[PDB]
Amino acid sequence: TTALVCDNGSGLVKAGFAGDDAPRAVFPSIVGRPRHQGVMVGMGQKDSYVGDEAQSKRGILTLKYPIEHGIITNWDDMEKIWHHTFYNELRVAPEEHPTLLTEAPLNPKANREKMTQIMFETFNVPAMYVAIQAVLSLYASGRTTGIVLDSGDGVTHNVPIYEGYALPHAIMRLDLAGRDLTDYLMKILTERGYSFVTTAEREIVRDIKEKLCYVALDFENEMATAASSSSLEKSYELPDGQVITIGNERFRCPETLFQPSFIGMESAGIHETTYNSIMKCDIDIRKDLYANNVMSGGTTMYPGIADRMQKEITALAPSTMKIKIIAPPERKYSVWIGGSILASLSTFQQMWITKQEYDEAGPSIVHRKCF
């Protein structure tokens, strides 16, 4: 039997089974659809490529993401990704065991409801449960208390947990994430003189970002340093041999998380939203939350981001508040890892929503009871 864990995030989908130590199936949430005219006969083609298929044909296909802002849009294509996932990446038929899904808290309930329908109609799984991503991150860390700053490709959200429970009113979901960082980077690459404009290039730039970008500890002085030094200039060989070289842009990009106004974003900097969430919590627990600032999600994989985060929070907080940030190796996958744990974690058997219950009450009961 066992169970299947599916970290259906944007950008990357991470799948593996209960009790596994690593999301064996890591591939991109991309569907590619033939950008050009079909000359040549017996091409072996199909009007849909997914994951690494789309990657191999990155500059041939129009690449689309089925979801955006943590919201599922192209339901058909999303479904197709799951189909591929289960049958080609995992190679297991739904009915063999229940599936653990996940979502970022505070998102249009239609997502949860429609996924439920799909799971119990397209796939017809034994049972299903959708869990909040942040919560799973703590399960991976093995903590019952802390602040979860979960920031990935899709969205960023901040959850406060304290011996379980979680405090709804202090949960904040910020529409600022990896995709925005990517787009911003392209814009400033134009300033330098590298016209990256295509989606194929958005994807290429994603890699560029991942390889070179880092977080400044003192943005202002490091900017000033860059203005008088070539030491930060790093080269990157594009697919076609076009080596490009990137300077201050290399940290100006991730800096936008701390100064959102750079992309026209109204809200406060990421560290300020963290702080504010903590401010919404009772002073009886604020101290413990300060000592457990769990960071996760792919956008926390920048060099020095934790150090910068500590610095920033320390400045915002009062003296004696021992700001302790938790950001271990492989935190990038902590949500999926937590899922592996929770799914295998005995007691959880009573939480699964059975197909029977779906057939009885329907979608809405999941909306009501599953968290």
Ligand X SMILES: Nc1ncnc2c1ncn2[C@@H]1O[C@H](COP(=O)(O)OP(=O)(O)O)[C@@H](O)[C@H]1O
Whether the CB-CB separation of 303 and 161 falls below 8 Å is answered with no
**Least Å from the CB of residue 296 to Mg ion:** 8
How crowded is residue 150: how many other Cβ atoms within 10 Å of its Cβ? 31
Selected range binding a second copy among 59-67, 211-219, 245-253, 292-300, rule: CB under 8 A: 59-67
State the DSSP string of 94-148: GGGS-EEEEE-SS--THHHHHHHHHIIIII--SEEEEEEHHHHHHHHHT-SEEEE
Q: Which is nearer to a second copy, 113 or 357 (CB)?
A: 113
Q: Report d(CA 284, CA 287) in Å as an integer.
A: 7
94 belongs to the binding site for Mg ion (CB under 5 A): no
Our CB check for a second copy shows the closer of 124 and 261 to be: 261
CA distance 209 to 223: 18
62 near a second copy, rule: CB under 8 A? yes
Output the smallest distance, CB 348 to ligand X, in A: 22
Q: What angle do CA 65, 70, 76 make, to 5 degrees?
A: 45
Q: Quote the CA–CA distance of 182 and 253 in Å, as a whole number.
A: 8
Q: Which residues 147-176 are close enough to bind Mg ion by CB under 5 A?
A: 152
How far apart CA 186 and CA 308 sit, in angstroms, is 24
- Interface positions, 7-26, toward Mg ion (CB under 5 A): 9
User: Tokens 């789309």 — which residue?
Assistant: 54
End-to-end CA separation in angstroms for the chain: 23
If one asks whether residue 51 binds Mg ion (CB under 5 A), the answer comes out as: no
Residue 306 makes contact with a second copy by CB under 8 A: no
Minimal distance in Å, beta carbon 299 to a second copy? 19
With CB cut-offs between 5 and 8 Å by kind, which of Mg ion, ligand X, a second copy, none does residue 59 bind?
a second copy
Which amino acid appears at position 176 of this protein? L
Tell which positions 259-278 bind a second copy, by CB under 8 A.
261, 263-264, 266-267
Between residues 152 and 339, which has the closer beta carbon with respect to Mg ion?
Answer: 152
Which helix H or strand E contains 160, and what residues bound it?
A: strand 156-162
Q: Which two tokens stand for residue 98?
A: 């229940």
Q: If binding is defined by CB under 5 A, does position 338 make contact with Mg ion? A: no
Residue in 337, 289, 256 with CA at minimum distance from that of residue 171: 289
Q: Smallest gap, in angstroms, from Cβ of residue 282 to a second copy?
A: 3
46: contact with a second copy by CB under 8 A: no
CA distance 62 to 78: 16
- Asked if residue 298 lies in contact with residue 267, where contact means CB atoms within 8 angstroms, the answer is no
Pick 44 or 329: Cβ nearer a second copy: 44
Find which of Mg ion, ligand X, a second copy, none residue 2 binds, CB within 5 to 8 Å per kind: none
Binding partner selected for residue 283 from Mg ion, a second copy, ligand X, none, CB under the kind-specific 5 to 8 Å limit = a second copy
Nearer to ligand X, 127 or 149 (CB): 149
**Which positions touch Mg ion (CB under 5 A)?**
9, 152
